[PDB]
Design a protein around this ligand. Structure first.
Ligand SMILES: [Mg+2]
Length: 1002
RNA sequence: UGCGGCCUCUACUCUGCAGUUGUGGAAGGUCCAGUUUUGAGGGGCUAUUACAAC
RNA sequence: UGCAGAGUAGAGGCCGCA
């Protein structure tokens, strides 16, 4: 078999990127080894899989972890492993599949790495009909070809390509006989490669595709651009972009190294502006492919970026804005600062929660001595000596369940509140002063913008102090219908139990009703499950029915729960014994069950459950009170609330739940005073409405234009009632005005929809009752309607959130850079903005910490839209070693980007210099030709040795050549002192020049 | 070779759920509707945030 | 990470028709 001509003609590029490919693979395998505490197919992680399929599994938990992460870091492995299963019958992918795919991929990658990085070696593996070809290479070519079929299908989903745009590939890959691979196709992944046996091998394009599975997207683009693989399509063609996208769609995801940026007022401003240019995710799903495409932008460094919001970062951004701005004197937000682990066999975790400004808390979290706060306990990064320790995590705000928790300090400039640790075991936390809904944060921001943060803060603190005064009075039993108004809290902001208590209507929930209802519901479900079966459930239910004693200390604990859920005469005994050991105050029915298999056990469990619940129902029907179940009459839920007891729980035990519409009255009073707001009826004006009116009437602004684009919703499809030829519902894209009108007419339109839809269901014989169909449609319309309504409500919220970020960011930058804003407007903001604030040029400075060092990257002038460049540079593996060479931790952004592009151009030229050196050595010394012919491994290292001994090179020169060559293979810079260098951006160029000169002979 | 129906398998996207006990439904989630394109309001349901103890 | 539903795309088997 001959090496493909593409490979032979582009050897320097295949050489470079094959090396990069194999290093990237090792990196992933190494990472998995570390995290899971245990010739790349002999790697510990790969050995594990090899043995996992064959022998009895000693840790299935580890096997399954390895298989899950391998598929995370190598996304193509999902497709190839699924094809390997089918190839082989079991339903699911097994360690053998994963092992076989990767053994072959690695084997062929290694082969081509060796051929392309060596002037001459005699490769036995290329001999026609050999073991390597028959067992590894030829199977892989077929696998790769089948992989690509699916990759092209994924292109439709990922980038919204249509059949017409992919047909230039999809229609021409295979040729029909009676089916066959069209080896004449320009992008054919298989060829005969002059094999006399006439078996399909990987083609050159095939080898390029294999390599690109193991590259980053940036390097896929650099690599493929140097190959003539695009027939006649030109640099700017859509076809070229399709080809390149197809070669990256499922490529390696590398584990990313830790970065910690220093934040500032300016940085937070810029984080907010770069957030508002992105599409909200709830909006993006509703948009046509055309308009979704408008968020796919090309960066400065010619990289495609999807400008879409991962998540709603409005609230954290606002908290950073307040902290770094030092805008609240007394309020501090709830931060987590890691976890305490102690050994006490299980390990127990406790979160290290506290309150302070994110910066100040972070300064306290990690001492110079590497201990936490004032604790003494080591921050790490079955041995009792290793415990206790604290998991290393950067201070972040706690934001769960749509809440923001706070602590109110009496005095200004208070220190961070970190938890005390006791007995190296207990983390003594603080109940937050109060808790606010994340939905309240827009109005707070608006209040802050209109009045100032200090006035905003005074209002939060005053509201908090009113609730406290109320709860104190409850504890003295001094709250009446007569005096409730004096506490200054509106009825709609008081708990219902207080309102019940003052009205003389205090009651618990009715236990008897609840038990009667629960028993009936559960009996019905039991029969549903019995029927479904004849036609973690069990672990949850077994514990549900386990009686509690001694504050619940008797019930099944975490580890034993996991074992129970996961869990021949002896085998039967063993299974029964488990429930004896778990002491199942007994489970009410389980003992009746006691068999041969899980399936028998589930059936018997359900029958016995049915008999138990029937008994209970029958006793309820006799009017009897029963008590056996998991409902517990002594819980306060079921008792009447008392003023004094509830007063104490509200004051001492819980945070104050702050009300919604805290800031409304003050916002409205302000706006009423402005003459621009003269028209507005403030009796029908919510804060979402008023934000929009403010920016249109006071600021001559409007929301981003992408909130006006047409949107798709299934429910609106159903209401529009338009069908294709075959009779499927059409996907409409409506305007808001259209949907307003459909919604008004939803009753009529739903009637029509159901009539037609029912008729279409009846066509199928499998489904044949009438009421069966009515239920199917009921659920169809409810679910769809609910999805639509929620989506539209949330998008409206994103609009005003963006208004607020824009306003705050603009305020920061106006005062800071001394730039000329005032003219800038949210309506101008767009993902690729060519005008307005995002296009303004400003000096910038980005400071970050990586691998225990602290660096700064500057710009004397930079468009605000490009602020994301800094993270791309900081993330780069080379940044560390490069700045070691520069001899400064402070550097220009432009210089580093130029350096990195020049490095990228030098790397293949290094490969070429090596090649020509090896060639010289082979031409001079004929001993090596013999060593090749008798199949002996010659390396660069070997050639250097011959050059050294026969006095062509000296040790110094040998060491330099070796070290530079190694640095480039690593995709990194060499250590300081190896070679004399120039300044940025010519460091890589100067290293290349040295290598070139040290590779000339004596 | 084209078209229609039925069955099986695979992929992608979107929505819902996950130690024990206690406390808490002014908040959050969800459901209903002659409600909202103004996270506003009404009615039902529900321990989700947190903290203590194991 | 395990489980359920809906929409979309693709492949295989069977039948009828041109
Ligand atoms: Mg309200």
């Amino acid at each position: 078999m001959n090496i493909p001509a593409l490979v032979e003609n582009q050897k320097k590029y295949f050489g470079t990127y094959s090396v990069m490919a194999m290093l990237n693979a090792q990196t992933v395998l190494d990472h998995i080894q570390k995290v899971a505490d245990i010739n790349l197919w002999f790697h510990p992680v790969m050995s594990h899989l090899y043995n996992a399929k064959n022998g009895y599994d000693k840790q299935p938990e580890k096997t399954m972890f390895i298989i899950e992460r391998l598929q995370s870091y190598f996304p193509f492995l999902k497709i190839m492993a699924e094809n390997q299963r089918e190839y082989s019958n079991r339903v699911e992918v097994n360690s053998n599949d994963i092992f076989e795919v990767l053994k072959r991929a690695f084997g062929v990658l290694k082969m081509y790495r060796d051929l392309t990085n060596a002037y001459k070696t005699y490769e036995e593996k290329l001999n026609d009909g050999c073991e390597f070809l028959t067992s590894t290479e030829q199977p892989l070519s077929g696998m790769i070809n089948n992989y690509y079929t699916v990759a092209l299908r994924n292109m439709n989903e990922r980038y919204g390509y249509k059949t017409e745009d992919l047909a230039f590939i999809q229609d021409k890959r295979f040729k029909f006989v009676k089916s066959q691979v069209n080896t004449g196709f320009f992008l054919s992944l298989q060829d005969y490669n002059g094999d006399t046996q006439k078996k399909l091998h990987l083609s050159g394009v095939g080898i390029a595709l294999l390599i690109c599975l193991f590259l980053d997207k940036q390097y896929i683009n650099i690599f493929l651009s140097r190959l003539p693989i695009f027939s006649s399509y030109n640099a700017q063609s859509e076809e070229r972009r399709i080809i390149i996208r197809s070669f990256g769609i499922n490529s390696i995801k590398l584990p990313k190294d830790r970065i910690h940026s220093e934040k500032s007022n300016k940085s937070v401003a810029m984080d907010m502006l770069n957030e508002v240019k992105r599409c909200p995710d709830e909006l993006f799903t509703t948009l046509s492919a055309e308009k979704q495409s408008r968020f796919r932008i090309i960066s400065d460094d010619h990289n495609e970026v999807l400008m879409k919001r991962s998540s709603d970062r409005f609230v954290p951004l606002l908290l950073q804005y307040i902290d770094y701005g030092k805008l609240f004197d007394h309020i501090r937000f709830h931060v987590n600062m890691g976890k305490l682990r102690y050994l006490l066999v299980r390990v127990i975790e406790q979160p290290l929660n506290g309150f302070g400004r994110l910066e100040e808390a972070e300064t306290m979290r990690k001492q110079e001595n590497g201990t936490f706060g004032n604790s003494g306990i080591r921050i790490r990064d079955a041995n009792p000596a290793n415990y206790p320790y604290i998991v290393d995590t950067y201070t972040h705000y706690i934001l769960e369940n749509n809440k923001v928790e706070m602590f109110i300090n009496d005095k200004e400039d208070s220190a961070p509140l970190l938890p005390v640790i006791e007995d190296d075991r207990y983390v003594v936390k603080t109940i937050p002063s109060c808790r606010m809904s994340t939905l309240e944060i827009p109005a707070m921001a608006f209040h802050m913008f209109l009045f100032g943060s200090k006035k905003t803060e005074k209002l939060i603190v005053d509201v908090h102090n009113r609730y406290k005064r109320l709860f104190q009075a409850m504890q003295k039993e001094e709250v009446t219908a007569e005096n409730i108004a004096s506490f200054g809290i509106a009825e709609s902001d008081l708990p219902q139990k207080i309102l019940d208590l003052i009205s003389g209507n205090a009651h618990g929930k009715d236990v008897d009703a609840f038990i009667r209802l629960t028993v009936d519901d559960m009996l019905t479900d039991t029969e549903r499950r019995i029927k479904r079966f004849k036609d973690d459930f069990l672990a949850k239910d077994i514990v549900l029915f386990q009686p509690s004693v001694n504050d619940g200390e008797n019930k099944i604990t975490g580890l034993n729960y996991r074992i129970m859920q996961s869990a021949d005469y002896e085998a039967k005994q063993q299974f029964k014994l488990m429930f004896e050991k778990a002491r199942l105050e007994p489970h009410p029915f389980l003992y009746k069950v006691f068999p041969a298999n899980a399936v028998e056990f589930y059936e018997r469990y359900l029958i016995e459950r049915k008999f138990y619940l029937t008994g209970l129902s029958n006793e309820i029907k006799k009017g009897n009170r029963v008590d056996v179940p998991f409902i517990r009459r002594d819980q306060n839920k079921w008792k009447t609330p008392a003023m004094k007891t509830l007063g104490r729980i509200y004051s001492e035990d819980l945070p104050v739940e702050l009300p919604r519409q805290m800031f409304d009255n003050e916002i409205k009073s302000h706006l009423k005073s402005l003459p621009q707001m003269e028209g507005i009826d403030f009796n029908n004006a919510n804060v979402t409405y008023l934000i929009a009116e403010y920016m249109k009437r006071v600021l001559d602004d409007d929301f981003q234009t992408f909130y006006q684009w047409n949107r798709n919703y299934r429910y609106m499809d159903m209401l529009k009632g338009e069908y294709d030829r075959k009779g499927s519902l059409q996907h409409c894209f409506t305007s808001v005005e259209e949907r307003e009108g459909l919604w008004k007419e939803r009753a009529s339109r739903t009637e029509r929809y159901r009539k037609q839809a029912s008729n279409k269901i009846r066509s199928n014989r499998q489904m044949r009752s009438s009421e069966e169909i009515e239920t199917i449609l009921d659920k169809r319309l409810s679910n769809s309607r609910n999805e639509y309504q929620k989506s539209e409500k949330v998008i409206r919220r994103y609009r005003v959130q963006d208004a607020l970020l824009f306003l705050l960011a603009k305020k920061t930058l106006t005062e800071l850079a001394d730039f000329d804003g005032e003219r800038f407007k949210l309506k101008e903001i767009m993902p690729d903005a060519e005008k307005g604030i995002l296009s303004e040029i400003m000096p910038m400075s980005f400071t970050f910490e990586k691998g225990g060092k602290k660096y700064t990257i500057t710009s004397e002038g930079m468009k605000l839209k490009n602020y994301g460049d800094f993270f791309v540079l900081a993330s780069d593996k080379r940044i560390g070693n490069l700045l070691e060479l520069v001899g400064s931790d402070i550097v220009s952004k432009e210089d580093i980007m130029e350096e990195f592009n020049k490095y990228d151009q030098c790397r293949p030229e290094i490969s070429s210099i090596v090649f020509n050196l090896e060639k010289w050595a082979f031409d001079t010394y004929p001993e090596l030709s013999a060593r090749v012919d008798r199949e002996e491994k010659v390396d660069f290292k070997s050639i250097l040795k011959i050059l050294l001994n026969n006095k062509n090179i000296n040790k110094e020169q040998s060491d330099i050549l070796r070290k530079i060559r190694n640095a480039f293979d690593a995709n990194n810079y060499p250590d300081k002192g190896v070679v004399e260098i120039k300044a940025l951006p010519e460091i890589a160029m100067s290293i290349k020049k040295a290598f070139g000169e040290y590779a000339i002979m004596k």
